[PDB]
Short mmCIF file of C-alpha atoms and ligand atoms in Angstrom, two decimals:
data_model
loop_
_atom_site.label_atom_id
_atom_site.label_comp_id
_atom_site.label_asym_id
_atom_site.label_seq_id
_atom_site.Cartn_x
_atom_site.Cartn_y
_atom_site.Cartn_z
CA UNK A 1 0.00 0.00 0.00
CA UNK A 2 0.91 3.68 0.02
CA UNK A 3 -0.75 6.01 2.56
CA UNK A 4 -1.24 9.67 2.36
CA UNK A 5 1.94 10.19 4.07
CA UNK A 6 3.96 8.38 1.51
CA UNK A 7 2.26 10.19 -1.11
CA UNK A 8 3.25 13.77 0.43
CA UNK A 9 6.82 12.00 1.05
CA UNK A 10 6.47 11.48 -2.63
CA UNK A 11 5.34 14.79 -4.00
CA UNK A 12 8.03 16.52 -1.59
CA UNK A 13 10.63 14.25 -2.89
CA UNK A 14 9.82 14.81 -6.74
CA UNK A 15 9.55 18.39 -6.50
CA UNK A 16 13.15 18.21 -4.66
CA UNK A 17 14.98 16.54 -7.84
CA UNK A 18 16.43 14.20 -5.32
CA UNK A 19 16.02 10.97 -3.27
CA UNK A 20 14.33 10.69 0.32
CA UNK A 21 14.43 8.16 2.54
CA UNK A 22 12.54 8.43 5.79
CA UNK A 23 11.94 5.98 8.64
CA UNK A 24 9.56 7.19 12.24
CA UNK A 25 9.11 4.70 15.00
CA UNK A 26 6.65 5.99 17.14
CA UNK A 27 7.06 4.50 20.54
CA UNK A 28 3.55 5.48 21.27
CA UNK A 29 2.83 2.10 19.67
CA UNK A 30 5.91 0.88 18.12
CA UNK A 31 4.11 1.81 14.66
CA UNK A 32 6.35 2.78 11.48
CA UNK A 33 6.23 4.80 8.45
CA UNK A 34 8.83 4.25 6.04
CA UNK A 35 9.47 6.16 2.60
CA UNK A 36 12.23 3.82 0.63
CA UNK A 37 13.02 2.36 3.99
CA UNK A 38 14.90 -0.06 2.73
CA UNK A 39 16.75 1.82 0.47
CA UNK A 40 20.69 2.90 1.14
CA UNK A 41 21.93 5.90 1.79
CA UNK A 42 25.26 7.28 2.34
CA UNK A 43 25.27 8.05 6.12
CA UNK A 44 27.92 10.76 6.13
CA UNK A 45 28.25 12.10 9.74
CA UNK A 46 25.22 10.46 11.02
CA UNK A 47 27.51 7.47 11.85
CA UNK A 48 29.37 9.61 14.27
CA UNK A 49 26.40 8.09 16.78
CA UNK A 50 27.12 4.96 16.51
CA UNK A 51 30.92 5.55 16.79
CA UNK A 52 30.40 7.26 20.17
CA UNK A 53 28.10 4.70 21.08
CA UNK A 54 30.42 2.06 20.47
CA UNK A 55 32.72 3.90 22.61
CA UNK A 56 30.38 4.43 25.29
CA UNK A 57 29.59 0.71 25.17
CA UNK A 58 33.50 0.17 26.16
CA UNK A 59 33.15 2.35 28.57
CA UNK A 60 30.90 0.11 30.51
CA UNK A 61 33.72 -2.38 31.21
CA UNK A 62 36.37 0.50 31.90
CA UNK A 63 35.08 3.01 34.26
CA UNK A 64 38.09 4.89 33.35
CA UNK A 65 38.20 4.49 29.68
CA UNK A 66 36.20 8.15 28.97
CA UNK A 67 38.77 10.15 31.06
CA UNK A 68 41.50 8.30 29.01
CA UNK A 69 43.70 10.75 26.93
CA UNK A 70 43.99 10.66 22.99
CA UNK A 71 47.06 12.61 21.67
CA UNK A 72 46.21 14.86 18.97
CA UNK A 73 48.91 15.62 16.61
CA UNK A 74 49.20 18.32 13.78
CA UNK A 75 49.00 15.65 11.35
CA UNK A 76 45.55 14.01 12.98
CA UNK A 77 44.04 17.45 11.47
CA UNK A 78 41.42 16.60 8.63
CA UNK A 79 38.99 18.37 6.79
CA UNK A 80 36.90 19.92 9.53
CA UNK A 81 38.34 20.37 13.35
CA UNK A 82 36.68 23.13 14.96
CA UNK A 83 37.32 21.30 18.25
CA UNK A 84 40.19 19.35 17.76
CA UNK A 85 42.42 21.79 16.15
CA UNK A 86 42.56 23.57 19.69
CA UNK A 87 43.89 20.44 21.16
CA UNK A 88 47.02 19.80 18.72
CA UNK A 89 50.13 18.80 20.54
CA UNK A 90 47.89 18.09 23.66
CA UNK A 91 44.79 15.64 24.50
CA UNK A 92 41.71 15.02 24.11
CA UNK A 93 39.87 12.51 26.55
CA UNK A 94 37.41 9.74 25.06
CA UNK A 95 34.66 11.78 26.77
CA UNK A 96 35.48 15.12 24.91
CA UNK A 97 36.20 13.47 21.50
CA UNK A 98 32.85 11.79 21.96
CA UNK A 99 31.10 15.38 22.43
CA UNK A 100 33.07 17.07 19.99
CA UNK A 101 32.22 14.74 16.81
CA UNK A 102 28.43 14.23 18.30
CA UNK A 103 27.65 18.15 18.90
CA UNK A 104 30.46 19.83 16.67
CA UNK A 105 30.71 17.12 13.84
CA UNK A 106 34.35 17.38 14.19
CA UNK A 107 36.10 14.66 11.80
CA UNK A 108 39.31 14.37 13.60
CA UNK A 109 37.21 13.63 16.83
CA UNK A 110 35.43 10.83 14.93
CA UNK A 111 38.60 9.64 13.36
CA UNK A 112 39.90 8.96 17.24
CA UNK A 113 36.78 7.21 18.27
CA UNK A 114 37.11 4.87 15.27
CA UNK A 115 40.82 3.91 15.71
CA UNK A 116 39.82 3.22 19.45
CA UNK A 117 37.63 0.76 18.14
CA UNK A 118 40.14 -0.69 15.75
CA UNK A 119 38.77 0.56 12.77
CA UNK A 120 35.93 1.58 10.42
CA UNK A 121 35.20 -2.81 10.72
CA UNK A 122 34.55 -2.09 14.12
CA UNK A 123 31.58 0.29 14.25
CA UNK A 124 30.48 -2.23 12.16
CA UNK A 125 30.98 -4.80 15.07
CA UNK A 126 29.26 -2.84 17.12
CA UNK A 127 26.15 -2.68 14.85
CA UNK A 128 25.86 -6.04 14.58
CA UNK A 129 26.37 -6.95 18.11
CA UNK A 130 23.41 -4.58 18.72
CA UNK A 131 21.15 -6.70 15.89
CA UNK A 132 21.84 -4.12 13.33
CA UNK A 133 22.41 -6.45 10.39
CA UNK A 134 22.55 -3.16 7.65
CA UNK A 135 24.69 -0.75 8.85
CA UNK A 136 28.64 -0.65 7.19
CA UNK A 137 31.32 1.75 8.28
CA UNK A 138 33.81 1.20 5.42
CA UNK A 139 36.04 4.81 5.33
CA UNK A 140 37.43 6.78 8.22
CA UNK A 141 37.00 10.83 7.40
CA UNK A 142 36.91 12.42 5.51
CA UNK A 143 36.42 10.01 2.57
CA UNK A 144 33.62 8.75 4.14
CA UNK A 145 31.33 11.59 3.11
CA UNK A 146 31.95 10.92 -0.73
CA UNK A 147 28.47 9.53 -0.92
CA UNK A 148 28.63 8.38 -4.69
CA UNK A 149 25.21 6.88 -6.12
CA UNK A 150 25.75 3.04 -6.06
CA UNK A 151 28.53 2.88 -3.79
CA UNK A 152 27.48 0.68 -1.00
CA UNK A 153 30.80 2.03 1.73
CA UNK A 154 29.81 3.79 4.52
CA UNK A 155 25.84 3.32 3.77
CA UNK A 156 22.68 2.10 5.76
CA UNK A 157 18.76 2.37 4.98
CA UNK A 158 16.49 4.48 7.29
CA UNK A 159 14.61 1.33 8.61
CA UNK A 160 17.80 -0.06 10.30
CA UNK A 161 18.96 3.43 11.60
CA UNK A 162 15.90 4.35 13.55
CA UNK A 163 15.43 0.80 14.85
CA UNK A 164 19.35 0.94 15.75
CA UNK A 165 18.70 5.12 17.33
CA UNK A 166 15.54 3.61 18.87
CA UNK A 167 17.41 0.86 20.59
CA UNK A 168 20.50 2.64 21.01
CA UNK A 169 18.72 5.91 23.18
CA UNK A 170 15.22 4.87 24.56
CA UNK A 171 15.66 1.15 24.66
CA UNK A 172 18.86 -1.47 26.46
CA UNK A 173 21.80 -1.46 23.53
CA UNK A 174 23.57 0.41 26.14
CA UNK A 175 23.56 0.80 29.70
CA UNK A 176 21.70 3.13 31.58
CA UNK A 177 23.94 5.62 32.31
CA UNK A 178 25.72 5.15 28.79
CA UNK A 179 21.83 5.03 27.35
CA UNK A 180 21.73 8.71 29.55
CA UNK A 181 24.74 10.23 28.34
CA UNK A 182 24.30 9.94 24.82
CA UNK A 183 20.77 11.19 25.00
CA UNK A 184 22.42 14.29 26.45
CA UNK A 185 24.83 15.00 23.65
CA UNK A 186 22.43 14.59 21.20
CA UNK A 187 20.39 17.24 22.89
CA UNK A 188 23.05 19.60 23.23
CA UNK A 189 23.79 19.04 19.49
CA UNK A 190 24.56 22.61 18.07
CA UNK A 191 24.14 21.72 14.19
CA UNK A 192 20.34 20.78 14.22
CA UNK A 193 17.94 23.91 14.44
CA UNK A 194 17.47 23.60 10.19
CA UNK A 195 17.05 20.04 10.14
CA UNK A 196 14.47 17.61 11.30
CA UNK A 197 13.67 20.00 14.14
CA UNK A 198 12.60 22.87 12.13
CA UNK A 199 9.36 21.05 11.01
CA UNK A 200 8.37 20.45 14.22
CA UNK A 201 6.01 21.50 16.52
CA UNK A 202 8.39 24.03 18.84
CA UNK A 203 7.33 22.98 22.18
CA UNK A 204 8.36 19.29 21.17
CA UNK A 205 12.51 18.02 22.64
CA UNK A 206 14.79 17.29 19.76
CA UNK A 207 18.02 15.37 20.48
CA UNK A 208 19.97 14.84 16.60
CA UNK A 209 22.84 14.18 14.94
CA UNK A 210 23.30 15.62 11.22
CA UNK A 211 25.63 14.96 8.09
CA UNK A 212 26.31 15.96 5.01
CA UNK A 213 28.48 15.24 1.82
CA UNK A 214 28.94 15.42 -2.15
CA UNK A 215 26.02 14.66 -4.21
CA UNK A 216 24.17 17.40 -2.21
CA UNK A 217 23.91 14.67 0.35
CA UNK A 218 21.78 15.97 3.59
CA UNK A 219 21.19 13.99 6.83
CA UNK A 220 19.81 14.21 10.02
CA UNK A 221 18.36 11.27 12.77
CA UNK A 222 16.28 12.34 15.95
CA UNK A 223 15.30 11.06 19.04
CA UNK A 224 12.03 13.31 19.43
CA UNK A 225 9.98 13.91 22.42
CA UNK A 226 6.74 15.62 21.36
CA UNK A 227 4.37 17.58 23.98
CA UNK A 228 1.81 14.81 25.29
CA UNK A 229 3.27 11.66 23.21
CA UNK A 230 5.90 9.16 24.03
CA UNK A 231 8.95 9.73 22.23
CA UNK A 232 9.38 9.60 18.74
CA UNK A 233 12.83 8.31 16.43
CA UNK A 234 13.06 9.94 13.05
CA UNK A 235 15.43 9.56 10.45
CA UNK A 236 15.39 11.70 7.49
CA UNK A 237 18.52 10.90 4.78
CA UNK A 238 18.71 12.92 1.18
CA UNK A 239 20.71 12.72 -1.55
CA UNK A 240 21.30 13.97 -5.22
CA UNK A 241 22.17 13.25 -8.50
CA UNK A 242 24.97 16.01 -9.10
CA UNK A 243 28.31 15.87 -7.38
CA UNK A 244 28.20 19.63 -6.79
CA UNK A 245 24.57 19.90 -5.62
CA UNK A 246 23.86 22.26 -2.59
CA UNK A 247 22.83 20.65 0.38
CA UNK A 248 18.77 20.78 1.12
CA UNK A 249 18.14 21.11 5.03
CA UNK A 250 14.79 22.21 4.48
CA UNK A 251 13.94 18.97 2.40
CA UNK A 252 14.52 17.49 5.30
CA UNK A 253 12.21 19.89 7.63
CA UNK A 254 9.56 19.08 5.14
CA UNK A 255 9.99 15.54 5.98
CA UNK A 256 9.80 15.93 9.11
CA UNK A 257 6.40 18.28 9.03
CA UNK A 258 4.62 15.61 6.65
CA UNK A 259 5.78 13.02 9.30
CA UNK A 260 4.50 15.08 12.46
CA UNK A 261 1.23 15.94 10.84
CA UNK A 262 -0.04 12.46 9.50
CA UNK A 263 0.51 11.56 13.15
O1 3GK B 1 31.20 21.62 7.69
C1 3GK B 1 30.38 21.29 6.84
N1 3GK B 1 30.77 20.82 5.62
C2 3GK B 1 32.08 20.61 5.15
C3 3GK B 1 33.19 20.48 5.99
C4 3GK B 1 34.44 20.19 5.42
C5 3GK B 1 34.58 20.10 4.05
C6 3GK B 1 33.48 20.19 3.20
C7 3GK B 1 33.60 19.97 1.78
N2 3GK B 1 34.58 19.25 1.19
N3 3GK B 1 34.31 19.28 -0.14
N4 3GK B 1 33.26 20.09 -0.33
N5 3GK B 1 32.77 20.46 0.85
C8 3GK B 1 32.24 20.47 3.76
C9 3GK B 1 28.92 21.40 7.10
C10 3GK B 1 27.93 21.44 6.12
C11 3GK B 1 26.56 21.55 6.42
C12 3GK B 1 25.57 21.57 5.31
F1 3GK B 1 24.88 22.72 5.23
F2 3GK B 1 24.62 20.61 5.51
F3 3GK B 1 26.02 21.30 4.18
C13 3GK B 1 26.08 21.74 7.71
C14 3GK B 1 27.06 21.70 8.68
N6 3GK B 1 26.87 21.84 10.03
C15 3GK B 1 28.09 21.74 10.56
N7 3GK B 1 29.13 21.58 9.60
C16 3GK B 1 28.45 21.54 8.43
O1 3GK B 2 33.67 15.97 5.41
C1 3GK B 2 32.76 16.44 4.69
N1 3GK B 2 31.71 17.11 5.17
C2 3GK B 2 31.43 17.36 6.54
C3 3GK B 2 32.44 17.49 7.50
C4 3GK B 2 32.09 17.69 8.83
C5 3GK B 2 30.76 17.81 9.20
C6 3GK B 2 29.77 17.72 8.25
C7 3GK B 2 28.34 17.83 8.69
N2 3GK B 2 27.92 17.60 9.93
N3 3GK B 2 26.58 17.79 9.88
N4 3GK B 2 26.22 18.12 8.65
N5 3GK B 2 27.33 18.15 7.86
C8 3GK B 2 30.07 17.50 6.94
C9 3GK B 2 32.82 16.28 3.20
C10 3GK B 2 33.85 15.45 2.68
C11 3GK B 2 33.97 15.23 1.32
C12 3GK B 2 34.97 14.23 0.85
F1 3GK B 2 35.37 14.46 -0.39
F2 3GK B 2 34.47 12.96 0.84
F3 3GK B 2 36.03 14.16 1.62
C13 3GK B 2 33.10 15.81 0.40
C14 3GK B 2 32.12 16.67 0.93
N6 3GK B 2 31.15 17.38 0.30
C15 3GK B 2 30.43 17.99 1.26
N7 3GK B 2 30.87 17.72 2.48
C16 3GK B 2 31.95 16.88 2.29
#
């Protein structure tokens, strides 16, 4: 079937010149409304959460592990390092790289959470040891954002991402004071305000992580906790045809609107 908010999903889509994928869990009732839900998408920095996550599921071995010091060095700088740049030839704890590449997007931070975990292969570990069978972390950054139509690296499909965000900030992937702390970066995420959260209701608690990359490719996944309903998890991934293309945060607004108002 096709409902009326896959049809407006649709129409918003077509009119974009691009390709939407959407996926809501509403934990109201565990119902879900998918728009190519099983389609991939290049993640770009929305795999940042699952990088810190991995981390913070470390972390619950090694009560020490988040205080642990990462040496930054001139030559860690990549392509975008508003936090880490300040820390070169010093250190950056676990804790702080966690927060900087959650609520900055800083690439160097993620590039030190995944060689703590060994690797791009292990976020990848991590997703499956958390029943995410879809998700593939493939690149560190900044090739990771290259996002080329086709390319399977560094891709997942919105149905696996919200059940993975779902499980990962509302539900037991993690433990509950892991489970707490990442819920309170992504709510002090400073990147958001055009995203997902500016087609929503104002009075409704956003926590989010965006990305972005070539092909115009424009992200964002939400933990949502609307006035007088249990929480919501929304992701909203867009990408398009043109290597150049601008990015399109307000496609992904629009999403979000459609999604709030068939509710
Ligand atoms: O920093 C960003 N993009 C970036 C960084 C490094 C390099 C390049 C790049 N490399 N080749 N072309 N562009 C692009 C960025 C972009 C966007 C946007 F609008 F969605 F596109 C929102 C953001 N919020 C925080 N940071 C961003
Ligand atoms: O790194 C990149 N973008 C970036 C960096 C930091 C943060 C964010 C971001 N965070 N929240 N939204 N956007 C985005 C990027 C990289 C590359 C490349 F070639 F693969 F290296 C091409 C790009 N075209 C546009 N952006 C990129």
């Amino acid at each position: 079937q096709t409902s009326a908010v896959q049809q407006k999903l649709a129409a918003l889509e077509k009119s974009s010149g691009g390709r939407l994928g959407v996926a809501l869990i509403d934990t109201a009732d565990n119902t879900q409304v998918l728009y190519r839900g099983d389609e991939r998408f290049p993640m770009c920095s929305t795999s940042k959460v699952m990088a810190a996550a991995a981390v913070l599921k470390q972390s619950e071995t090694q009560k020490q592990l988040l205080n642990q010091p990462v040496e930054i060095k001139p030559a860690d700088l990549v392509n975008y390092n508003p936090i880490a740049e300040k820390h070169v030839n010093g250190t950056m704890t676990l804790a702080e790289l966690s927060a900087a590449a959650l609520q900055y997007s800083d690439n160097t931070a993620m590039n030190k959470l995944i060689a703590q975990l060994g690797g791009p292969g292990g976020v990848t570990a991590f997703a499956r040891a958390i029943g995410d069978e879809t998700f593939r972390l493939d690149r560190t950054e900044p090739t990771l954002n290259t996002a080329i139509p086709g390319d399977p690296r560094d891709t997942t499909t919105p149905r696996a991402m919200a059940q993975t965000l779902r499980q990962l900030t509302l539900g037991h992937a993690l433990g509950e004071t892991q489970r707490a702390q990442l819920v309170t970066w992504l709510k002090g995420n400073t990147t958001g305000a055009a995203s997902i959260r500016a087609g929503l209701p104002t009075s409704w608690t956003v926590g989010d992580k965006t990305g972005s990359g070539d092909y115009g490719t424009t992200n964002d996944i939400a933990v949502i906790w609307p006035q007088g309903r249990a929480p919501l998890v929304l992701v909203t991934y867009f990408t398009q045809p043109q290597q150049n293309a601008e990015s399109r945060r307000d496609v992904l607004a629009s999403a979000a609107r459609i999604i709030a108002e068939g509710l």
